[PDB]
Amino acid sequence: LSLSGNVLYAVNYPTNTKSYWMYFTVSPSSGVSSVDLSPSTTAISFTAA
Amino acid sequence: DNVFTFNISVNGTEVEYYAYVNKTFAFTYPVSGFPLAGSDIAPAGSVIG
Numbered sequence: 219l220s221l222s223g224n225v226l227y228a229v230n231y232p233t234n235t236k237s238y239w240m241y242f243t244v245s246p247s248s249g250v251s252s253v254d255l256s257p258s259t260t261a262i263s264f265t266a267a
Numbered sequence: 268d269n270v271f272t273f274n275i276s277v278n279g280t281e282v283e284y285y286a287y288v289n290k291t292f293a294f295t296y297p298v299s300g301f302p303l304a305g306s307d308i309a310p311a312g313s314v315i316g
């Protein structure tokens with residue numbers, strides 16, 4: 219997969235005390251082959267180290 | 268500590284205020300073109316004192 223858009227981040231602006239969502243767009247890289255994205259098989263990890 | 272005075276007019280009457288300053292410090296405030304109240308961001312075409 220390639221990141222194929224900007225990464226958007228939403229917060230309780232302007233107060234910035236609380237975090238709402240992140241949105242971004244992905245597509246199979248260089249148009250070569252299909253990707254299984256079933257949520258049983260695939261993981262998405264998130265770390266703010 | 269350091270003291271200076273300034274006058275404002277209220278009900279057409281001059282009111283003198285005495286400002287006492289503990290240490291040298293700077294602050295900023297909006298002068299024009301600032302719709303982003305709450306943010307601390309000066310947008311392009313804003314004017315900041």
Ligand SMILES: *[C@@H]1O[C@H](CO)[C@@H](O[C@@H]2O[C@H](CO[C@H]3O[C@H](CO)[C@@H](O)[C@H](O)[C@@H]3O)[C@@H](O)[C@H](O)[C@H]2NC(C)=O)[C@H](O)[C@H]1NC(C)=O
Binds near residue numbers: 274
């Ligand atoms: C700013 O406000 C002051 C008080 O709010 C005022 O002073 C009062 O005014 C008179 C005395 O005449 C003053 O006038 C000249 C020019 O304004 C001053 O430079 C001068 O030092 C005199 O003080 C008096 O009735 C009253 O007691 C004064 N009060 C105090 C607290 O001083 C100022 O006139 C006014 N303007 C300026 C430029 O300072």
